[PDB]
């Protein structure tokens, strides 16, 4: 394959988890900084498990 | 092409796409005889936003 199976599986794991975080963000008016860190984190993520 | 490691975690690395972009406009001959190995930055690209 041109992907990873598992890595792409993470990819759709942390994807689900990112929606969550967001909405649980959203729920607790959390500041939009800290949101996009999360997500560049959850990103990183995704691409140290790649 | 010489090789390009890219993850496209952040929305930054557009600058890639943008760069095969400028090389299909100003060179789209030598763009025509390397655009597989090109197409395999972009499945990445695609795979990772799409």
């Given at each position: 394959?041109?992907?990873?199976?598992?890595?792409?599986?993470?990819?759709?794991?942390?994807?689900?988890?990112?929606?969550?975080?967001?909405?649980?963000?959203?729920?607790?008016?959390?500041?939009?900084?800290?949101?996009?860190?999360?997500?560049?984190?959850?990103?990183?993520?995704?691409?140290?498990?790649? | 092409?010489?090789?390009?490691?890219?993850?496209?975690?952040?929305?930054?690395?557009?600058?890639?796409?943008?760069?095969?972009?400028?090389?299909?406009?100003?060179?789209?001959?030598?763009?025509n005889?390397?655009?597989?190995?090109?197409?395999?930055?972009?499945?990445?690209?695609?795979?990772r936003?799409?």
């Amino acid at each position: 394959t041109v992907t990873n199976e598992f890595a792409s599986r993470f990819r759709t794991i942390v994807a689900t988890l990112a929606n969550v975080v967001n909405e649980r963000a959203v729920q607790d008016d959390m500041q939009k900084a800290t949101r996009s860190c999360t997500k560049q984190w959850l990103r990183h993520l995704e691409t140290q498990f790649d | 092409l010489k090789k390009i490691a890219e993850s496209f975690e952040d929305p930054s690395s557009i600058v890639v796409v943008l760069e095969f972009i400028l090389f299909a406009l100003f060179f789209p001959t030598e763009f025509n005889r390397i655009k597989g190995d090109i197409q395999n930055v972009l499945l990445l690209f695609f795979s990772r936003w799409y």
